[PDB]
């Protein structure tokens, strides 16, 4: 019973909750955000009244839906660093990604997967769930529902959906000495054996067709790389020695910013700008602050840190 708990928690009468149930799939706002380079991107976000009931639903369903341990996105106590620590000691790397990953998830497949787990729900639960977590673009007669992004409940649903695909691909890659990992809609493989990575594009396609109908591979974003060129995994560089790094350009970015700060020629906005980047770099590396102290002295760094 889920409708009763929601009614009790938010103190909704029968009529108000019926109205919210009817008008829920249309309380979204569409807007554009700039692109790094040239272009634009389109997002859709719900209202404040719907967001805090979506978070409640997610908190209610979290301890009952299994999730594979190879997905390092939107998970507790996991991040980019734990994703990159898997491939930090391998030579050859291959990267692939999907095509319109989020809007290919529909309530038919969500309820099909939900029925297989053995959890039984009444008609009322199915009706409330369908009308609360999905978006309806187009006119009022569209009768099509997609998840979208920018909604607090989409990432968990997507992670739960791709469980079978993760499980089946894992034990196929393990038997051939290949490391595998997925982040949102990005998939990475890495290994040391020569001429073994040319066979996986057909395998992933067969798995995608067999385990989750509808999805497909964007074939224009496939990458092969080795130790003779640039290597990075989701924004962190891998030196040939086998250590994580941020890149030489950013190191000289920060060294020059701090040197210009020592002469008192930095605006107050750039201080808050650089402090976050410094903290992130220190977390990624573990020895950035020691090098800075060994170069400029602890007195100046401490004064800069306590500034503002």
């Amino acid at each position: 019973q889920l409708t009763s708990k929601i009614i009790s928690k938010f103190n909704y009468n029968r009529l108000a909750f019926q109205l919210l149930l009817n008008e829920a799939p249309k309380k979204y706002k569409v807007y554009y955000i700039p692109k790094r380079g040239a272009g634009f991107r389109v997002i859709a976000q719900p209202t404040k009244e719907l967001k805090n009931v979506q978070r409640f639903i997610v908190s209610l369903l979290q301890p009952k839906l299994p999730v594979h341990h190879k997905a390092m996105a939107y998970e507790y106590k996991k991040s980019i660093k734990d994703n990159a620590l898997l491939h930090k000691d391998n030579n050859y790397i291959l990267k692939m990604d999907f095509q319109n990953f989020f809007n290919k998830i529909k309530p038919d497949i969500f309820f099909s997967k939900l029925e297989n787990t053995g959890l039984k729900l009444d008609s009322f639960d199915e009706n409330t769930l369908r009308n609360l977590l999905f978006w309806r673009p187009g006119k009022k007669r569209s009768t099509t529902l997609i998840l979208s992004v920018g909604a607090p409940s989409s990432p968990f649903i997507s992670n739960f959906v791709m469980y079978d695909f993760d499980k089946s691909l894992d034990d196929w890659c393990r038997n051939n000495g290949i490391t595998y990992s997925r982040y949102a809609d990005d998939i990475t493989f890495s290994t040391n054996i020569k001429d073994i990575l040319c066979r996986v594009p057909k395998v992933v396609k067969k798995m995608l067709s067999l385990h989750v109908p509808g999805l497909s591979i964007n074939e224009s974003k496939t990458i092969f790389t080795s130790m003779a060129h640039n290597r990075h995994v989701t924004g962190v560089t891998l030196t040939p020695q086998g250590n994580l790094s941020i890149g030489r350009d950013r190191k000289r970015m920060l060294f020059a910013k701090i040197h210009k700060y020592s002469l008192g020629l930095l605006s107050s906005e750039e201080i808050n700008k650089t402090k976050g980047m410094i903290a992130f770099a220190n977390y990624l590396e573990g020895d950035f602050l020691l090098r800075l102290q060994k170069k400029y002295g602890c007195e100046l760094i401490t004064k800069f840190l306590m500034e503002g």
Binding site: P34, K35, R36, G37, A38, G39, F40, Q99, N100, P201, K202, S209, P213, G214, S216, N218, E219, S220, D249, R250, M253
Partner: protein, 228 residues
């Protein structure tokens, strides 16, 4: 193909950054003399001029006979050797298909090009669609493009990726606007139908008449005579 507040990022001398800088600058000044004499226009023109057009690589999946295959092309000369029925023509039509969308978007934006015919997809049972991908490198600037078609009778959709070509075409049109006699790239295709070779008294010639079609056939010979 739009404007931005010019996110700082890190220092670079990419052609894209010059394009964005010029777009940001032109949104403020109104006098055309200043724009026509600004240093950003000079930087954009010099970068566009010294860059050399060069197609980098191509890949084919499930198109005609070829099942899955990737090629890399040299920047000056390439030759394919084979016997009959080995898909020598298929590669050429694939390249003409991908180049047609760039040809179309220069005349006028958001104009469609050439699609995949319904009888080109592979005849095997297990196929579902066909795709072609490509990449164009302007010295240090990279673009890519994907064209695909789903097999008739299926019920799963596929789209095309057309951000790169539209963005590249906008640079050419913007440079063509502020320069009197700007040049354009040359694209041509000499199919096996050159065998067929064997008026209203046109008076005006321009550089956009050669962009009517990518292939060579029939009336081009007639016009050559009138031009000569």
């Amino acid at each position: 193909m739009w404007s931005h507040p010019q996110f700082e990022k890190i220092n670079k001398m990419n052609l894209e950054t010059c394009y964005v800088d010029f777009l940001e600058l032109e949104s403020h000044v109104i006098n055309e003399d200043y724009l026509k004499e600004s240093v950003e226009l000079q930087k954009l023109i010099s970068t566009l001029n010294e860059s050399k057009f060069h197609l980098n690589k191509i890949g084919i999946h499930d198109f005609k006979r070829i099942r899955e295959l990737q090629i890399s092309l040299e920047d000056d000369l390439t030759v394919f050797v084979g016997d009959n029925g080995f898909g020598k023509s298929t590669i050429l039509d694939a390249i003409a298909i991908v180049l047609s969308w760039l040809r179309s978007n220069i005349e006028k934006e958001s104009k469609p090009g050439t699609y995949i015919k319904s009888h080109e997809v592979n005849n095997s049972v297990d196929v579902e669609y066909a795709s072609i991908d490509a990449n164009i490198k302007l010295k240090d600037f990279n673009t890519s493009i994907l064209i695909t078609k789903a097999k008739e009778g299926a019920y799963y959709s596929r789209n095309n990726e057309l951000l790169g070509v539209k963005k590249l075409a906008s640079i050419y049109r913007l440079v063509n606007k502020y320069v009197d006699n700007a040049s354009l790239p040359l694209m041509a295709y000499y199919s096996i139908a050159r065998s067929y070779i064997g008026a209203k008294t046109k008076t005006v010639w321009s550089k956009f008449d050669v962009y009517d079609e990518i292939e060579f056939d029939r009336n081009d010979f007639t016009d050559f005579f009138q031009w000569l």
